[PDB]
Amino acid sequence: KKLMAQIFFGPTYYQRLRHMVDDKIHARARGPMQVLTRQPVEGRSRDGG
Amino acid sequence: NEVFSRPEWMILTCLPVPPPPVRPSISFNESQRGEDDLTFKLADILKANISLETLE
DNA sequence: AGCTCAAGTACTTTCCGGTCA
RNA sequence: GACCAGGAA
DNA sequence: AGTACTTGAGCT
């Protein structure tokens, strides 16, 4: 069925940005602990909390 | 406070030495120590103390 | 010499490349 | 691991 | 980043 509205529609230059989710996503439940503080380590990379 | 803090105790004659877990040697590989900043400062204190002790 | 101040001080967010024993 | 530096909702 | 207190030193 037709849309009751008309759409603004056309080309528009879009850019792919360096922030991608599978590089961001992170989860931890028990894992490497700092030595001094014995708390979880920092950073996705290091598998932190 | 006559029990928990007398003024005389604001002055140090006996220096409590914290144990490794406070100043742990972060030891990369095996043939390379990597001691903690405090372990050094104590080392200095120790040394400085021995110079004074023998000096007098 | 002391005593007043202006001019001096340190101190007040969650993520993700280099040099140092 | 300290430390410095740079860049993000 | 502007205000805090507190230190500091210089002048009459």
* Locus of tokens 């400085």: B48
Task: Give the pair of three-digit tokens for residue A13.
Answer: 């230059």
Method used to solve the structure: X-ray
* Locus of tokens 């006996």: B14
CA B16 from chain centre, in angstroms, equals 7
Name the nucleotide nearest A37; use CA and C1'.
D1
Q: Resolution of the deposited coordinates, in angstroms?
A: 3.4
For residue B23, the distance in angstroms to the closest alpha carbon of chain A comes to 8
Chain B, window 2-41: residues with a beta carbon less than 8 angstroms from a chain A beta carbon: 24, 26
Residue pair B34/B28 in contact by the 8 Å Cβ criterion: yes
Write the CA distances from A46 to A9, A40, B22, integer angstroms: 45, 10, 23
